[model samples]
Target: MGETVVRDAVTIGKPAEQLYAVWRDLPGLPLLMTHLRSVEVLDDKRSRWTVEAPAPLGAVSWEAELTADEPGKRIAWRSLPGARIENSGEVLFRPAPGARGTEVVVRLTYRPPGGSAGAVIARMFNQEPSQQLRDDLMRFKREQELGLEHHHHHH
Candidate 1:
C-alpha cells in the first residue's frame, strides 16, 4: 500500500559519460546487476524488468519506462503501475571532485505487497534498502570499469 525510499551514493574511477553510456543499454542490466533476473528492452526509453525473489515469492516482473534522461548527467525511471511491487528510481552521474572520476547516486523508491516485503526482499536479494542500493551501484561501476560488462556492451 505504502512505499519505502532508500538513497545511496558511490564514487567510481570513470567518467560520467562512460558510465551513462553503458547503462543506457537496458537489456545489459542483468549482467552487471546481480539482483535482476532479466531485462528486455522495448526501446531505448522503455523495458521489461524481472527480479528474482526467494522460493515462496518466486519472481516479480514489470514494465518500466524512462521518465528523465540526460546523457552523462542523470536518468530516472518508474515501473508502470499494477505490478506486485511498485518500484521507481533515479540515477545521477556527477563529476567527482579533483576530476578524479564520477560520483554516482541512486535513489530507489519501492512498495512491496506485504509487511515483510522489505525484509523478505532483503533476504531474497541483498540486505534491502541501503546495502542493496550500495551493492547494486558498486557492481555497476566495477562492471563498466572492467570493460564490456555485458553482451550488449560489446561493440
Candidate 2:
C-alpha cells in the first residue's frame, strides 16, 4: 500500500533541552499530549500506546521503538510489526539561537493495513491522521511549557 507522510513545525518558548526532556518522557505523554490516551514503557526506548482516536476502521494499539537519540537535538521512533497499521515518525528539536526558544519539527508516515485502497481513502480526507498527531505535539509543547509556569507559581 501507499504511505502518507505529514510534517509540521512550531516554535516553542522553551530551551531545546527542556523541550527534549518532555519528548523523552514517554510515560508522561497522556498528561501533556491530547491524542495519546496512555503510554506504557516496556524499556528504555520501547513502549506501547493506546491512541485516543481510532483509525479509519477501528481503534489501534501499537508498539513503538525509539531509534535515534541526540540528547537535545533529535529523536526518532517507528512502530513494530503486527499492528493493524504501519507507522513511523520522528520529532526533532533544534535550538533557535538569539531567539527565545526551540524549533520543533515532527514528521510522520503511516501506511494503513489494507493497502492502496486504505491510502486512497486517507488521501481523500482533507486532514490526514498525521495532522491530528501534529496538533497533539503542539498541544504538548504548550502544555509542558505552561505547566512549568504553573508549577513555579504554585511553589
Candidate 3:
C-alpha cells in the first residue's frame, strides 16, 4: 500500500530556540510523546527509534539518520532502508504572529514493510494518526508552558 502521511500543528508558549533545544535531546523524546518507547542516540546525526504498538504488533524499532537540521527552525529525519516500518518526518518551529509564541508543525510519512499493518495498528486505537500527532503536540505544549516546577494548589 501507499505511504500514510500525518501532519499537525500547535502553538506553544515558548521561544523557537527553547522548544528546539528540548526536541534536540533525542533520548528524551519518549517523555514527551507517549507512543514512543525510546530513542537511543547512536551519534550526533543517527539514532535508533522504538515505539510501542498495540499487543498484536508489539514494539517496532528502526535506525534513522538526520536529513536536515536548522537550529531553532526545522529538523527532518528518515529511517534506513532495512527498517520494518519505513518512515520519515520533519518538524518546523515558526515564530507565531502577535508574539504569542512558536508554531510547531510536524509532518510524518510512513509505510509498513509488509501488509497494511501500520493502518491496522492505527485502527486498533480507533484513532487516526493525525489525532495522535495532535495529542503529542498538546503534551509538548503543556510541558513547555507549565514545566515540572510549576505548581498549583487548592485555595
Over 1-155, each residue of candidate 1 has an lDDT whose tens digit, in order, gives: 46667586666675554554554552333343334535334344344334333321233344455556565678776444433324566789887778767887878876534553433443665422434444434555556656634444553
Query: Which candidate comes out best when scored by lDDT?
Result: 1
Worst 10 residues of 3 by lDDT: 146-155
Query: For candidate 3, what is the lDDT?
Result: 0.53
lDDT of 1 at 117: 45
Query: Per-residue lDDT for 71-108 in model 3, tens only?
Result: 57787655444343255667898888778788878787
lDDT of 2 by residue, 1-155 (tens): 56768677666676554554454432322243334535434343344344444441143344454556565678665444434325566678886656847887877776535543433444555342434455434445556656453322232
Q: Tell me the RMSD of model 3 versus the true structure.
A: 12.6
* TM-score result, candidate 3: 0.45
Error of 3 at 146 (Å): 3.6
Candidate No. with top TM-score:
1
lDDT of each: 0.54, 0.52, 0.53
TM-score, per-candidate, Cα-based: 0.46, 0.44, 0.45
Off by over 4 Å in 3: 1-4, 20-63, 81-85, 109-136, 147-155
Q: Give residue 73's lDDT in candidate 3 (0 to 100).
A: 76
Deviation (Å) of 22 in candidate 2: 4.0
Instruction: Tell me the deviation in Å of residue 9 in model 1.
Output: 1.8
For model 2, the run of ten residues with the poorest summed lDDT: 25-34
- Lowest summed lDDT across 10 adjacent residues in model 1 is found at 51-60
